Design a protein around this ligand. Sequence first.
Ligand code: CL7
Ligand SMILES: CC1=C(/C=C/C(C)=C/C=C/C(C)=C/C=C/C=C(C)/C=C/C=C(C)/C=C/C2=C[C@H](C)[C@H](O)CC2(C)C)C(C)(C)C[C@@H](O)C1
Ligand SMILES: CC1=C(/C=C/C(C)=C/C=C/C(C)=C/C=C/C=C(C)/C=C/C=C(C)/C=C/C2=C[C@H](C)[C@H](O)CC2(C)C)C(C)(C)C[C@@H](O)C1
Ligand SMILES: CC1=C(/C=C/C(C)=C/C=C/C(C)=C/C=C/C=C(C)/C=C/C=C(C)/C=C/C2=C[C@H](C)[C@H](O)CC2(C)C)C(C)(C)C[C@@H](O)C1
Ligand SMILES: [Fe+2]
Lengths: 284, 329, 420, 349
Amino acid sequence: ASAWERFCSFITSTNNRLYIGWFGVLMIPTLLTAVTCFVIAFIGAPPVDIDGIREPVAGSLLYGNNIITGAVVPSSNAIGLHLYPIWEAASLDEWLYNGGPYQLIIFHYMIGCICYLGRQWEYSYRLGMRPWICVAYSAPLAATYSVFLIYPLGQGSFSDGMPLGISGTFNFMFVFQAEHNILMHPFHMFGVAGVLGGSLFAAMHGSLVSSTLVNSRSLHFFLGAWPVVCIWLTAMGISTMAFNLNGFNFNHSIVDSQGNVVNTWADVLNRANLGFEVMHERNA
Amino acid sequence: EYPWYSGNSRLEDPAVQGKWLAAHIAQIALIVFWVGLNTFSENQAFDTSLPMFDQGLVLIPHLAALGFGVGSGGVVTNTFVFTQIGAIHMVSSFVLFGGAYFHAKIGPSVLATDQFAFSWDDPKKLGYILGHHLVLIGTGALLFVLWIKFHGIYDPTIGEVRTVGDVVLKYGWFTPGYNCFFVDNLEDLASGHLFIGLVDIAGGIFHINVAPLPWSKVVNKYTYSPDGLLGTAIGGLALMGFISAYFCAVNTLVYPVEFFGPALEVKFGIAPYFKDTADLADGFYTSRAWLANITYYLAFYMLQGHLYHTLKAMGFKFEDIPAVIARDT
Amino acid sequence: AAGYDRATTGYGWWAGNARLTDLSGQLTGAHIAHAGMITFWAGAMTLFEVSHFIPEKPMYEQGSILLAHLAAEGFGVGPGGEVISTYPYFVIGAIHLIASAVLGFGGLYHTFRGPAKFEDYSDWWGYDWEDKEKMMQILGIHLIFLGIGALAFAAKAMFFGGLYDPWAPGGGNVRLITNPTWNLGTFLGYITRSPWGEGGWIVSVNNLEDVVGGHLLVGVHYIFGGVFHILVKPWGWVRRAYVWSGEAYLSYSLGALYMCGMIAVGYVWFNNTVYPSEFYGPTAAEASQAQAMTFLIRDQRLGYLMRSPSGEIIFGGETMRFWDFRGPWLEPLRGPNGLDLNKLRNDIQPWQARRAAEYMTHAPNYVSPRSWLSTSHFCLAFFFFVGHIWHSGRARAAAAGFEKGIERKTEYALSLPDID
Amino acid sequence: MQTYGNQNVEYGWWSGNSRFTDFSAQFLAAHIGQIASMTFFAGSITLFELSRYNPDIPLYAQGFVCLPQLSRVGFGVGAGGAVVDTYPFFAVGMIHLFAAAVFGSGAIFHILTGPKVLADSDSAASQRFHFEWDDFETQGRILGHHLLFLGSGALLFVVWAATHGIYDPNVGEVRAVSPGFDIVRIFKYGWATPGFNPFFVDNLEDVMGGHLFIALIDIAGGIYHILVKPWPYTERIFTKSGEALLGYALGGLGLMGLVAAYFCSVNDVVFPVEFFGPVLQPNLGFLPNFADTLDVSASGHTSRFWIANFHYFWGFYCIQGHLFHALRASGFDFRVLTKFFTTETVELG
Ligand code: CL7
Ligand SMILES: CC1=C(/C=C/C(C)=C/C=C/C(C)=C/C=C/C=C(C)/C=C/C=C(C)/C=C/C2=C[C@H](C)[C@H](O)CC2(C)C)C(C)(C)C[C@@H](O)C1
Ligand SMILES: CC1=C(/C=C/C(C)=C/C=C/C(C)=C/C=C/C=C(C)/C=C/C=C(C)/C=C/C2=C[C@H](C)[C@H](O)CC2(C)C)C(C)(C)C[C@@H](O)C1
Ligand SMILES: CC1=C(/C=C/C(C)=C/C=C/C(C)=C/C=C/C=C(C)/C=C/C=C(C)/C=C/C2=C[C@H](C)[C@H](O)CC2(C)C)C(C)(C)C[C@@H](O)C1
Ligand SMILES: [Fe+2]
């Protein structure tokens, strides 16, 4: 009953309402920090110079936006990959102006996510069950790390990271499509197949069980495995596109015998990408 | 019994003694074999035009110091002498290999003529062996003295080879006109070599003639043993290596700047070393630096090995070390 | 045959290798054969890239990655990143192919001919997983081999040809390092550097003296640590803080390899010193800054900079995100506070102005070697993280005993007090 | 040792050096090894400093503790504290290293020569060296011999200063010094009457006279202790145990360390300015410090700063160790401290 032993028996105990565990020891502060800062910076936060051009972009509720259009703007383009802690800032108002809250939120959130995976494993151990829920959870984890961490690393700044907002997500998707043509990348096709097929198999399994309940184990194995594998693949696809290894490109493929070019659907898709791109790229 | 990696410890057995002898013969052959082989490769890679202290020539400068193809200084006129010396050594190697094989598997397994046959605890035997080896060593020293008298070695101050007073009792006191590591006189070198040859021969005569005395059997607490004898020999070797490294680093009369490069500066980081004080190209070091540093560090690890063998010779066993660290977890 | 079926092992064919857990000889044979595979790939790819090499085009335009690794070490290269002769590459490839042949022979021999379980043949080679001392000693021996390898790399950099230093004057040049760094303050400053953009953890090394000194230091430490492992026992707390089985050791190795893979991606993508831009092409930062400088050169010839957030002189536009990037062709045009405009007015030597455009074209249609390496090894590192989790969980459960399912009649959750 | 009550105590490896307190041969071996370590430090550090010496930089600016000490005592220093010839320093360091090797060889010799106890060794003359932690006669003779060695060392210093000369910052160049002898002025330095303060000695002649006096005193005391058994009252006062003698020695050493620390920071003659740097000033915040009295900007700290501060700490913690060992040897066990917050009295012998 050493004080240290008593503490350990408290944390690694299956009688709390929510299991804490050693991974949860890191999970709780980081997640609480991320949630608190996200709430604060989503309700009210100054406009952020996303383009690093002294011109700001607002995203908070008190500055005009609603839930659909509000967001937490990524840290400024001038910062690059530099960590921007509050104590490493010239002035609080400036630190907000450069987009520090985004950095705070995403870093605490990513650490909390990986610790949450660890906590899942730990409790599976403490209860005496095979410890592979965490393996399945590793897929959406990979996806978030792709959009928030790996893509900015490949692109050199967190200004290319995903905004934390509903409309920011769509803006990110369209700019990503413009610059990398993700639709014609096979890994995203695997991901689309994964989500749609996962819904299909979920509906089929639920209908069958709820209809007759009024190797079969391999059935549930396949249920678990299919969408997880596809999400791993599409997360890897995003990560590869973060290193300028873009998808397929079939523009200007068929040419007339004399030398003219006959259009195909890929050219229409490329022209749509061209529109998205030229609307992007403020200057050149 | 010993494992294969420690296989040579099997030769420690007096049951198989002559084979042990074979090994030593082989070693010397290998040694003299290298003296040939190295030189040949050196003679291949030695450009005459360049200064001799730039390319990897260690033996060629040593020959250059002993005359052997030098005129008014900075003069190379015949690379055939170097090849001759290398060939002599390499041919002697074949003879020594023959003797090694004769004792290895043709000769008796154990010497037990019997006059050569000895035991690890026969002080008269070792005394006479020591005397004979000392006599040969002093003979080589006097041979070098004769070479000085007749052929004469390169001198930098004279700028040319030249042939040739015992104030050695003052050099030994390192009086400010001394510190032999700074000798600059051919006559000093010749006289000191005469003295050391004479003293070596006198000691050899004495050791063959007279058995070890009790007064000196008192101090030699444990050296009358294989490990003890090996340890004392290794310690002597390390001492000699340190002295030779210092000589090579500092002395310029014996090691001329022409073939060896300028003197070395003694520097110390965590461990000692010798720096060039020469504006050689980056990545290149004078032959003097190579000689001094490799010699010194070989001598340092010889000292470590002397400690190991000496400790094993006295009442100590190294395999007990983990067990101790087992008890005090 | 016996033991090669599901009934006699419990593992389906798709988990066949699991059967090898306690068959020491065959497992060793599999490892040796796999090493043979790796070195065979190395040699074969080297020979392929040599056979398709073209001296006029750069390596990164030509599309060779195994050749660039040798080029960095300076095997048959010249000043300014120019090959002299592709013979040493052929030498290396042939040596690797021969070594692969030997290793494959050894692997087949232990797989089929030799003893199945070394424990029967001898005891130094017979090992069981749950023997902590034996595993410690084997780890120590292999650590010693790694240390010898690292010291070998340092010795090559100091005596045998050296490395292609791209910070030599007038473009890169093959050099022999003579002044290795050994101050411990430098080493600590490297380790405790921020992994973030606030510097770079170890990826931020920019001179070859630090590289050579670091390899010296690590080789010394590896040899020492191997000796220590051979000579001592695992402490009590160490014995109580690990899992001791084959799968657990595999999981530890997987975690280490995942970490190394991520760090290698960081090196290949952010470093222009130990991956010279002459061979792997420009980094993303280098490409952006070269584009900015070439446009500035053209605009100054026909008749744009700005202030940093800290107030220095940097380029303008998107490239501000690479404001702190340091490069060999750009470093001479530096200043106490950012690249001075006056310096850019009349200090652009011809080779730097050629490198700027040559890098502007090849911004990572065309895919840089950096892109290939980075993407491939990020994917490999992620999957090795997943494997680390899988095997660590399996090891922990199997050691506990509940790996093959929950026990119907002694289920643990059924005994806990309800939380509500 | 102490072994409160229960004998045959078991010591962990952290306190493992108390195991050989009863093995005279091993005791000798340990102390010969320690002295080897000291002289090895002297020589090796001399070389380590010589490697990075800059004639341009003033000597005290660079971090040295040995070049100033050698240059003070003659050894290749020109007029105005100029290091003309840097070879004698090399010679001194080399002799120190050779001595260290000799001492270490002797240390291993004794650690492996014979029995752990020097009583059993059948040398029949090494048994002349076996001592006890109770007998004051043998320890008195030992003390006498060691005092003889110290007095011989002081004599050697006197001779070397008389013949070879020695640096004199007041003169400004190496110079032979006449050995003074004035018992009156020695005692006036003892009282620290206003003219003479011991830590402000101005003439090397006074220092030399005091050293002559010290040599005479040490040699006389050594003879006296070899010949004469301790008086009974010294058995009444002092306890007879090893840890007790360690405590006495530790107290003495702590005092000497504090004295030397104060000496370094203040005296300018025996610690010349050109070698060690300008004098320090003693400050007392929480703990005593020695302020450099010089702008540490672009000059680090003078060697005098380092010597003085290090030896203040050495002296202070030697005092604390003396208190610890005296408390143990008198009989006080510190385990009783754990009973502090209870109602049981925190007290025993
Ligand atoms: C992907 C996560 C993963 C990693 C990276 C990983 N393992 Mg395993 N792994 C093992 C070793 C191992 C080593 C030495 C090692 C590191 O080098 C790894 N692992 C690494 C063996 C001890 C043990 C037995 C493995 C065994 O017996 O056989 C392996 C089985 C198969 C089918 C191999 C075929 C591979 C797949 C077709 C993947 C295709 C990739 C593709 C070709 C790449 C090129 C692209 C192409 C399109 C051109 C093991 C298992 C197993 C699994 C599972 C699920 C894993 N793993 C998973 C991983 C067992 O059931 C199983 C297990 O433990 O059951 C008890
Ligand atoms: C006493 C003792 C022992 C130790 C015993 C040892 C190891 C004693 C050490 C003995 C040594 C190291 C003796 C060394 C002697 C060196 C000599 C005699 C040097 C001779 C050099 C000469 C004559 C040089 C000559 C020139 C040569 C050269 C050309 C110069 O240009 C000119 C000139 C003239 C200087 C043990 C081991 C027995 C036991 C110990 O416990 C105590
Ligand atoms: C044999 C044996 C073993 C023991 C084996 C051991 C411990 C062997 C020890 C081997 C060592 C440590 C050998 C040391 C060799 C020393 C060398 C190679 C010196 C190198 C110096 C060089 C290369 C020059 C370096 C410069 C080069 C240049 C001039 C610089 O400006 C300065 C300067 C001088 C440092 C075991 C343990 C394996 C098994 C036992 O049973 C038996
Ligand atoms: C009193 C007592 C005890 C205590 C006993 C102790 C500890 C007594 C303390 C004794 C001390 C502190 C003695 C110190 C003596 C100091 C001396 C003798 C100093 C000599 C210094 C000299 C000679 C300096 C010489 C020069 C050196 C220097 C150059 C100066 O510029 C000038 C010059 C030339 C004078 C107990 C506790 C042990 C037992 C109790 O019951 C009784
Ligand atoms: Fe279900």
